[PDB]
Design a protein around this ligand. Structure first.
Ligand SMILES: CC1=C(/C=C/C(C)=C/C=C/C(C)=C/CO)C(C)(C)CCC1
Length: 141
């Protein structure tokens, strides 16, 4: 993948989500939670100023907020997901935002990037990859 810009500001609505089940299973998220969440449309709100990100992922079941500064390791406590601690580091690789979440689970992280007018997110854990695509709702520019 390749990002067309580093500016990820805006509100984005999920248009596809593939193998979210596999990803959730790899995180040991319980059956009942998986069944509720698997096909609920998510919305992502990204507030970005340079390297400083504030993000919200919302649905009619659960939300998940994570804020970070690119380059700076932080303690991500994954409440409402698997309730673990990971040492999260988000970096740019070209115009792809790459997160590695170091902790118990192997190969845990995500990659997020813009192509033209859509936002793409790939979530990984263990041997599972989930691919998501979000259409634009709002951008500042
Ligand atoms: C598993 C699971 C969820 C996971 C959301 C995730 C994994 C969000 C990741 C956000 C990161 C990648 C921010 C940058 O986009 C939500 C809360 C939807 C519903 C409850 C079950």
């Amino acid at each position: 993948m390749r990002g067309s810009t580093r500016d990820q500001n805006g509100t984005w609505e999920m248009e596809s989500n593939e193998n979210f089940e596999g990803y959730m299973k790899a995180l040991d998220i319980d059956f009942a939670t998986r069944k509720i969440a698997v096909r609920l449309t998510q919305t992502k709100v990204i507030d970005q100023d340079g390297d400083n990100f504030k993000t919200k992922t919302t649905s009619t079941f659960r939300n998940y907020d994570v804020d970070f500064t690119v380059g700076v390791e932080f303690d991500e406590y994954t409440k409402s997901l698997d309730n673990r601690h990971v040492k999260a580091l988000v970096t740019w690789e070209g115009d792809v935002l790459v997160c590695v979440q170091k902790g118990e689970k192997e190969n845990r992280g995500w990659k997020q990037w813009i192509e033209g007018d859509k936002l793409y997110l790939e979530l990984t854990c263990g041997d599972q990859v989930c691919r998501q695509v979000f259409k634009k709702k709002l951008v500042p520019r």
